[PDB]
């Protein structure tokens with residue numbers, strides 16, 4: 001019988017357990033398979049079992065033999081079980097060899113001479129960049145009509161160019177029909193071609209990890225197998241919360257950290273934090289250079305009928321690029337003309353994963369783009385490019 | 398006759414010249430050296446200095462780094478020149494400018510002869526600074542003694558570089574040349590290195606420099622320089638140091654060699670051109686921008702001087718030296734030491750009820766990706782209103798991150814916003830979640 005139980009070792013549950021322990025509460029963390037910073041705490045018991053609900057109030061602990069070892073309870077339970085790679089139903093998967101998801105690839109024994117990636121998502125493009133830099137010939141197959149479709153399209157054109165210049169082969173409108181393996185190698189059979197590879201990466205998305213007997217509970221699932229949560233991350237049973245990837249939406253480590261803020265606010269604070277007031281959420285696609293994003297693209301701003309102005313700056317026009325010895329990239333911003341507020345930004349270039357946080361703060365705090373234009377920046381840096389990136393007049397659309 | 402005369406191809410000058418020309422005005426820009434097209438930063442300052450620091454961090458040799466420094470300097474010098482000269486409303490005049498009167502400027506060739514004279518209703522003095530040559534016995538006879546600019550053009554890698562001076566520029570050359578394999582000794586006359594900086598963070602730079610093999614000394618009075626033919630000895634009160642090359646880096650003074658006696662332009666206690674809050678000299682139609690008017694010597698201060706002068710001559714005159722906002726800066730040692738606002742010593746001396754909180758870079762998970770555990774992040778907060786008084790970031794990406802805290806200070810964003818914000822991951826910026834967490838609720 002505990003004070004708080006978190007199920008899973010994600011970021012939200014781990015930091016929530018550490019906070020509750022400093023309060024003095026006795027916490028139970030259930031994790032099937034950093035590590036000491038939780039166990040070594042006097043007020044936290046990490047249980048190496050598999051969690052499975054017996055009711056809305058008690059949780060069964062299963063050993064590796066799927067036997068019930070013990071049952072545990074607490075007035076509040078946090079579900080934080082993450083997600084798993086989506087396995088595609090294709091011909092010859094269970095028999096094919098040298099096939100990997102994202103986790104299996106990160107633990108690969110060898111460097112592939114030819115890595116084929118089925119899937120063209122952000123994670124897929126990241127791995128293609130990481131392995132081209134390591135000398136691997138990389139082919140990636142996208143089923144859709146274009147790469148990174150939710151991103152600004154003449155920025156991604158620069159990204160595709162820089163990816164191709166590294167020897168990466170991109171393909172669009174590719175249906176993959178069959179996988180076969182001649183033992184040491186594996187061939188991917190597609191609509192356009194049949195590629196031979198040393199390793200095949202399945203990178204076609206992650207689906208919530210919802211395996212803990214929800215039939216014994218009143219916890220509901222949404223359209224896509226995610227745990228349904230309200231604005232305070234409450235499931236349909238009010239004393240049980242869901243955080244991280246196991247509920248729907250954005251799958252980021254920092255979103256999981258913000259989930260802890262919401263749940264702590266609901267359980268220990270004034271309950272003012274919700275999923276409706278996270279502020280603008282930035283993200284980075286770690287290609288080379290990194291593509292960082294926050295707010296709208298100009299395509300979205302035009303679709304929502306903003307009176308907007310967009311402006312761009314090639315990284316080759318940024319003098320700091322000469323010190324970096326890297327001319328690749330494109331910086332792009334979208335501005336609201338009514339006020340002078342920033343609607344969104346796409347920074348494709350070095351330091352973009354750091355610079356993007358400046359624009360995030362400006363959007364949240366209603367700092368007009370004129371302030372970023374006229375500000376004093378350190379020199380020589382990439383940040384000082386904001387003197388030029390935001391140096392423009394209204395073009396009224 | 399021109400509409401605007403700019404004396405010196407500095408940062409404020411070239412930027413103001415380019416704007417006025419877009420307006421339709423005819424601008425004359427006087428620059429004495431064709432090796433100086435673009436200013437001190439492009440040719441003998443920030444750009445060549447940090448090109449060598451960046452390349453030395455990458456394992457490039459001395460010869461390879463210096464060759465790429467030449468290409469980068471030559472490319473930007475040529476770029477800066479044509480950005481101005483090719484404008485139909487800007488004439489770049491290759492002469493030394495000297496005032497004939499309050500209203501017209503002589504153009505002198507390198508033999509100090511007057512070739513012609515020009516005039517304009519507004520004149521901008523943007524002549525920068527020069528290295529302070531110290532009065533030391535044997536300097537005018539010692540060999541292998543270098544400027545900051547002489548060192549950036551050195552034709553050999555020194556086995557032992559001895560640095561007279563311990564300012565920011567001196568420590569940047571020490572780190573730069575240590576990373577290139579040179580043995581470096583640096584000598585500071587004062588009691589301590591980098592005063593006015595958070596001396597807790599300074600002790601980190603010091604140890605990180607010493608762990609690279611840099612020898613540092615304080616309370617050192619350099620009394621004499623002597624040289625044989627291939628070695629130079631620096632005679633001090635503690636020791637004699639034998640060197641391949643000696644760097645004199647003890648500050649830079651305003652360059653006012655403009656025959657100001659033919660004008661009513663006044664000079665201040667420290668040889669600077671006196672200016673008001675709108676950067677007007679004591680002659681109202683003459684402005685002074687950049688290093689020559691004293692104060693902070695940075696390229697971005699010079700760029701902000703263009704904003705003040707443009708505001709005064711073309712805009713609503715609201716921009717002054719009194720509303721620049723908080724001024725960040727970076728000392729480009731390895732990793733860079735970046736700073737904005739008050740030090741905790743300053744906050745304590747003014748009697749704030751302040752909170753200081755630090756975070757070691759080795760406690761930032763991104764450092765493992767960076768392959769560098771060195772650094773210390775530090776913030777100083779006013780406890781009565783949660784405002785950010787200052788910060789010192791010593792670590793990777795600090796020269797970028799410091800601009801976030803600058804923005805927060807200027808806009809009166811309380812530290813709790815930076816503490817609770819969502820940051821990209823994995824980054825150095827997300828360390829702010831911990832750096833700005835004072836753990837007030839960490840109790841029973």
Ligand SMILES: *[C@@]1([N])=N[C]=NC2=C1N=[C]N2[C]1O[C]([C]OP([O])(=O)OP([O])(=O)O[C][C]([O])[C]([O])[C]([O])[C]N2C3=[C]C([C])=C([C])[C]=C3N=C3C(=O)[N]C(=O)N=C32)[C]([O])[C]1[O]
Nearest residue numbers: 008009010011030031051081082102244245251252253256
């Ligand atoms: C049961 N039944 N009982 C006990 N414990 C259980 C259990 N089922 C599962 N588990 C355990 O639960 C945890 C879950 O951990 P985690 O971290 O998945 O939880 P959470 O809070 O949802 O975290 C989400 C977050 O980690 C994730 O979004 C990021 O990893 C996303 N991400 C990312 C992901 C992949 C797959 C790759 C290849 C790369 C990246 N890169 C980034 C990136 O650069 N930035 C970013 O912000 N996010 C990235 C587990 O231990 C189970 O055993």
Ligand SMILES: Cc1cc2nc3c(=O)[nH]c(=O)nc-3n(C[C@H](O)[C@H](O)[C@H](O)COP(=O)(O)OP(=O)(O)OC[C@H]3O[C@@H](n4cnc5c(N)ncnc54)[C@H](O)[C@@H]3O)c2cc1C
Nearest residue numbers: 405407408429433436437442443494525687688694695696
């Ligand atoms: C080694 C070193 C490293 C530095 N690193 C950095 C750094 O990393 N970041 C940073 O922000 N700052 C840095 N600085 C400072 C920066 O170089 C200066 O603060 C800045 O360039 C000042 O520019 P300015 O507008 O005052 O004029 P300057 O850029 O100094 O230009 C003045 C110009 O006027 C010309 N001139 C002078 N007198 C006459 C005359 N009579 N007639 C005609 N022309 C004339 C000169 O030839 C020169 O081209 C560094 C400085 C040095 C020395």
